[PDB]
């Protein structure tokens, strides 16, 4: 973060009102390619640098931290004059002399660790892949979904022909009246408590047995359809791990990257087998691993290929965003050092101890596992009042109609 | 690390569950359009029409009753032209218990559960005795997770001084009968165990949550010259993607217990406790 | 050896021009010239041949043709090269047949192929006896004696201190929840009779609805025809819509109708596709209805797919089984030690990774339809046979009447 | 979903009110009667012709005739719920399952002797195991 | 799920003058259709809820109802 005025970092506080630890980074400004590097001072925090006060205190050193020159990771590459191969970057610092304690998220393998030498490690990760979460979606805006509107139509005309035929049907058997018979059926669909005109002729009577049955398994099976519109209502376009069949074989509307000059590449030309597709990401590796999530999120990048200690904090803050995959590549971080230096086995048991004590299980609460935003627990679907709506304007506006028929029924009787 | 394995048989009811569809608003509003009709139903549809008196009390119980379903006998309003308002009404009673089971139906197919410890830093483990019949844990000694926790909660070792099994094999055994109710053991043969026991009736505290996180290794002797060459072996087979196939062969169960996908359940007197609320 | 492309299985891309050499993991394809790398399924076979045996090898594609066909007389293609003594094998997609095998003996098959049928995939269906599908004989065989018995009962106490037609209307309507005005009894024993009938009305409401819902979340996709001895596909002129599909020509699949079906085969002739690839956005596009292909390919193209929405008929039928193969002179004395190879693969397990990692995809599912009239039109039919039930007791009232 | 408890307390439950409300209406400006009341609510059953002419039984009524309705719709659910959420997984999904190249000793498994299979077993050397 | 696939076949001497002839007649009663008969005629012929179980426990008391109902009807009588 930005230093403020007279260089001094700003007062600040946690939620449980500590006062956060800082110091003091003097780093490259605006480094964009292509452009001049200058030195300002800055200010730093974080999980490392709370930990890195911790060894400062009980091994009683002292410090003086300062940011990459480029703000590259750390691999081998080629000179131009013959293969005189080089490190780069902040791995590349550590061996020049120009730092003596690599105190960043740093992966252990076995390219790295012919040249420097490790600790234990602090924090157990692996690689896994960030793809844009889609929305869930809803289809609950009428009722007229679990039937079609070409049955409402012939059930409300089959109601009509029931209820004419209880008359013509009783009256010619050797009384009750039509309109009396015409809210039997119905008083039965609607389940009401209106209307008290029954057949009394057993011609008639038979007639009105099915009839009550038939009311049982249109409304049931309504009921019982509705059930599998929250069930049912689920896609399927993820990715299963690295062994996922559209990643081996690259497709132009599918693109796929990583950070540049990382453990990942390393990983990925160890191997043999995996040489068809990392070539597709030889064009398309990004700068920063901070950037690379930006553009997910603008859609221009479908997956993302990185540690899983970063890409389960932002799945949780930024919760637009959802992880999928399992871990593939597992190897915790280390406070790299010199080859040969003497304080390499105090700080490997500085940190074996702040494992126990607790503490860094302290620290893991208190920077990594705050929550913001839930997960997606299957698809939950509560009722609210947006999603019924023309239920709730049938009975509001067909009140008015009632209004009509006073007028006319009124209107018969003069 | 140090892990935590429990019995699984109780795990987590979920109360209060009837409120769990709709919402409070549709609720509330759901009385207010229960009165509008009714108020103009006497004072217009009933007053003004041709065709002893059909009371306010009436109109309110009337239309109440379609809503749970009529098993009331009543007196329906007269007039012919205040029969259809109420069948207008009735229709939107039908759809609205319709979608009320309909719903809670989704609820119940995908319920989750909650475990019934945090960890060990829970108020079950640091201070038993002040609750139901104490909670029960213990583990096998002479080992690190003992020397862990007899540094860290020298308070609650000594109440693990009675419970002392001998050994995994022995103490999974008497976790289901009983005797003890917690387990605590280092988080990778815990894990195998919890998925290697059939009808998955063992799961792990936090579905793979370990709480000391230190790996295993191969002790040299001190000073040796080995150290620097069989490190890089190790770090060797990470790469080649070997371990991830050793991984498959031998760590391999057939419980999927990371799942927490309840086949159903039997509700007893405290699962459906709110409901009686309701009616005190 | 000669080979032609085919995408799932001989992959031609050209040669990375920065290095002016083909890439890593490949062998160059040296056209009839140009060169460029190729790999695939068919090829990743050939290298572990020359492995196990030690041999030489040049890929080339061939251009006289298309995996072979007889111009009466002369043979072009993979198969007219290798007749004609311009090469030794011919890898590939090649289909053992009998008219190819009389003149150049092929090898042991490695690829069960045949011929089968791609069609797009519609609406999801439910049987339409839903209504009472789901629900055993043995159900309703002993709920109405159990109404009838109760009936008699509650009638013949009554006089112990009520019509049978009353009794009927009252004790039944419980079922079907309470919606019908109805006549009760007024004594103290009765009135506990009734209770007993309800209770089990409520169960069977809530049992009801519960087992609807149930079977109709999860079920199987109804079929929309069957294979090529449907009517359709052998009569296609005796249907008022005519059903439209076709076949590549110049293959295996198009010889084999013409010597079984050439009634059909006449009418094909007008819809054809030059390619794979373009035929099947026809089918995207509703252009087509059917497609007749080789099936291990349109079982992978089923599964290269996006969105799903094509799937073949049978979930995998295959007819006319006939598998994959290697040409070679007709004498070659090579043919055992080929035999040999491809076999010992079968016994380990290194054939069936192949097909893991290259004929493999996403969606080898169920989906939510509307009930619509048609699907429910089943328990309609319940509805009529009652109202012609009314008719038979009216007549038969209306003559006894009478005399 | 519901044990031999709850059924304790659904019949007595129901009972105990009846007498409450005649209780409450009668000292207000008989048991036969009330009992049909509440009863066939729960059922559903138009029995009796008893109705509360107090205020004080209508408000207890409107709320008696929601504890009904509940207890339907959610045993409702829970029967359909098991339908779905039952499975008894014994199923071995082929080969590579650890069931079957770790025996138990007691999930024996067994084939023809001589034929395919045995000459299949024994030439791969991981299959020495089962 | 299938784990070893390889076909059926006729065996022969390793010198047998009719193996051009039977390999050959087994491919030409593919493209016929003749083993489609064979595969109807002998193997693809033969294809094989709620019901009156699990609801045992409400169809006795129905009767048991009745057989309740009944000594309480002498009751009834009496009084
Ligand atoms: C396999 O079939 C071929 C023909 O398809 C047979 O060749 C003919 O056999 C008859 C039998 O006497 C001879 O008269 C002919 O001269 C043969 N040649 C031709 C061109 O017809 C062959 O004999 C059959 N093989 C066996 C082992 O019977
Ligand atoms: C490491 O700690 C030991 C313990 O006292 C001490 O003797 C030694 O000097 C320390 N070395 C370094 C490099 O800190
Ligand atoms: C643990 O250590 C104690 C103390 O030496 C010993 O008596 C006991 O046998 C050891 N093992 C077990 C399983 O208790
Ligand atoms: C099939 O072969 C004939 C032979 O002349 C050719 O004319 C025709 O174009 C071929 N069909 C194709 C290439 O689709
Ligand atoms: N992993 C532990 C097991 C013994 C224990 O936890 O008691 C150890 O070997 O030290
Ligand atoms: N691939 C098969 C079939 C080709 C086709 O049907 O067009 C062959 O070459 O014989």
Request: glycine share 8%; hydrophobic share 45%.
């Amino acid at each position: 973060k930005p230093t403020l005025s007279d260089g001094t970092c700003k007062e600040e506080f946690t939620v449980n009102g500590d006062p956060v630890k800082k110091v003091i980074c003097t780093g490259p400004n605006d480094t964009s390619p292509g452009s001049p590097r200058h030195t300002v001072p800055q200010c730093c925090y974080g999980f490392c640098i709370d930990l890195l006060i911790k060894l400062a205190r009980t091994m009683n050193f002292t410090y003086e931290v300062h940011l990459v020159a480029d703000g590259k990771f750390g691999t081998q590459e080629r000179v131009n004059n013959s293969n005189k191969k080089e490190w780069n970057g902040m791995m590349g610092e550590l061996l020049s002399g120009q730092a003596d304690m690599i105190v960043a998220p740093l992966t252990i393998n076995n390219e790295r660790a012919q040249y420097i030498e490790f600790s234990k490690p602090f924090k157990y990760q692996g690689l896994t892949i960030l793809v844009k979460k889609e929305i869930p979606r809803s289809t609950l805006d009428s009722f007229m979904q679990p039937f079609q509107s070409t049955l409402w139509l012939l059930v409300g005309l089959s109601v009509h022909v029931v209820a004419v035929m209880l008359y013509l049907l009783d009256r010619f058997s050797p009384a009750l009246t039509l309109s009396s018979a015409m809210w039997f059926s119905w008083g039965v669909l609607l389940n009401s408590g209106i209307g008290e005109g029954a057949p009394r002729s057993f011609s008639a009577r038979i007639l009105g047995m099915v009839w009550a049955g038939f009311a049982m398994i249109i409304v049931a099976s309504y009921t019982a359809n509705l059930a599998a519109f929250l069930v049912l209502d689920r896609p399927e376009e993820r990715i299963t791990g690295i062994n996922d069949p559209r990643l081996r074989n690259p497709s132009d509307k599918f693109i796929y990257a990583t950070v540049k000059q990382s453990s990942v590449d390393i990983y990925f030309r160890r191997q043999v087998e995996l040489s068809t597709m990392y070539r597709h990401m030889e064009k398309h590796n990004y700068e920063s691993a901070a950037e690379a999530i930006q553009a997910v999120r603008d859609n221009k990048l479908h997956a993302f290929i990185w540690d899983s200690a970063v890409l389960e904090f932002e799945a949780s803050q930024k919760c637009d965003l959802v992880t999928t995959g399992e871990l593939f590549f597992r190897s915790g971080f280390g406070i790299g050092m010199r080859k040969d230096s003497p304080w390499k086995q105090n700080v490997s048991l500085s940190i074996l101890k702040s494992h126990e004590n607790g503490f860094m299980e302290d620290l893991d609460k208190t920077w990594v596992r705050y929550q913001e935003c839930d997960s997606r627990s299957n698809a939950p679907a509560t009722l609210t009042f947006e999603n019924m709506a023309g239920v709730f304007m049938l009975v509001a506006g067909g009140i008015v109609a009632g209004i009509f028929l006073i007028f006319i029924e009124i209107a018969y009787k003069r | 690390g140090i892990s935590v394995m429990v019995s699984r048989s109780n795990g987590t009811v979920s109360p209060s569950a009837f409120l769990e569809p709709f919402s409070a608003d549709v609720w509330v509003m759901m009385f207010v359009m229960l009165l509008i009709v009714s108020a103009v139903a006497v004072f217009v549809f009933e007053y003004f029409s041709p065709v002893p008196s059909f009371t306010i009390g009436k109109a309110i119980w009337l239309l109440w009753g379609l809503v749970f379903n009529n098993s009331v006998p009543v007196q329906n309003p007269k007039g012919t032209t205040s029969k259809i308002m109420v069948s207008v009404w009735a229709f939107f009673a039908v759809i609205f218990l319709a979608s009320y089971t309909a719903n809670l139906a989704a609820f119940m197919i995908q319920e989750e559960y909650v475990d019934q410890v945090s960890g060990l830093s829970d108020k079950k483990f640091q201070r038993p005795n002040d609750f139901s019949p104490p909670f029960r844990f213990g583990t096998v000694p002479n080992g690190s997770t003992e020397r862990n926790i007899r540094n860290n909660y020298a308070e609650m070792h000594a109440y693990m001084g009675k419970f002392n099994q001998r050994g995994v094999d022995d103490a999974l055994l008497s976790l289901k009968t009983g005797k003890l109710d917690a387990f605590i053991y280092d988080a990778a043969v815990l894990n195998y165990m919890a998925g290697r026991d059939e009808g998955c009736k063992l799961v792990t505290i936090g579905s793979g949550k370990v709480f000391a996180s230190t790996g295993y290794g191969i002790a040299i002797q001190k000073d040796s010259g080995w150290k620097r060459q069989v490190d890089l072996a190790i770090l060797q087979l990470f790469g080649d993607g070997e371990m991830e196939e050793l991984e498959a062969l031998w760590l391999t169960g057939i419980c999927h217990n990371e799942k927490n996908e309840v086949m159903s359940s039997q509700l007893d007197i405290d699962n459906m406790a709110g409901v009686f609320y309701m009616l005190g | 050896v000669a080979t032609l492309e085919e995408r799932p299985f001989v992959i031609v891309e050209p040669a990375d021009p920065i290095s002016g050499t083909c890439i890593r993991d490949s062998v160059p394809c040296r056209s009839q010239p140009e060169k460029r790398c190729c790999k695939g399924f068919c090829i990743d076979i050939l290298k572990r041949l020359a492995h196990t045996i030690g041999f030489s090898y040049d890929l080339y594609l061939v251009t006289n043709g298309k995996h072979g066909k007889k111009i009466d007389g002369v043979w072009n293609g993979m198969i007219g090269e290798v007749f004609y003594q311009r090469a030794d094998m011919a890898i590939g997609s090649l289909t053992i047949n009998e008219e190819r095998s009389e003149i150049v003996d092929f090898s042991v098959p490695f690829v069960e192929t045949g011929i089968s049928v791609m069609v797009a995939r519609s609406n999801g269906t439910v049987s339409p006896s839903a209504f009472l599908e789901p629900y055993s004989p043995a159900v309703w065989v002993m709920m109405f004696v159990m109404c009838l018995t109760v009936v008699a009962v509650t009638v013949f106490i009554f006089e112990y201190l009520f019509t049978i037609g009353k009794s009927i209307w009252l004790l039944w309507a419980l079922v079907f929840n309470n919606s019908v005005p109805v006549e009760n009894p007024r004594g103290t024993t009765s009135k506990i009779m009734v209770l007993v009938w309800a209770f089990f009305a409520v169960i069977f409401l809530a049992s009801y609805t519960a087992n609807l819902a149930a079977f109709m979340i999860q079920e199987e996709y109804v079929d929309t025809v069957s294979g090529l001895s449907d009517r359709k596909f052998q009569r296609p002129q005796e249907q008022y819509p005519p059903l439209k599909f076709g076949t590549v020509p110049n293959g295996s699949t198009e010889k084999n109708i013409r010597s079984n079906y050439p009634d059909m085969h006449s009418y094909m002739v007008r819809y054809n596709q030059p390619r794979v690839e373009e035929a099947l956005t026809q089918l995207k596009a509703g252009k087509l209805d059917a497609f007749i292909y080789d099936a291990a390919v349109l079982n992978y193209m089923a599964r290269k797919d996006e969105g799903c929405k094509l799937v073949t008929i049978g979930s995998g039928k295959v007819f006319a089984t006939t598998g994959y193969g290697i040409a070679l002179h007709k004498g070659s004395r090579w043919k055992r030690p080929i035999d040999l190879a491809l076999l010992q693969f079968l016994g380990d397990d290194e054939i069936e990774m192949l097909e893991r990692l290259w004929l493999s995809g996403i969606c080898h599912e169920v989906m939510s339809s509307k009930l619509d009239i048609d699907n429910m039109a089943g328990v309609f039919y319940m509805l009529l046979v009652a109202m012609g039930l009314s008719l038979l007791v009216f007549a038969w009232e209306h003559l006894v009447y009478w005399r």
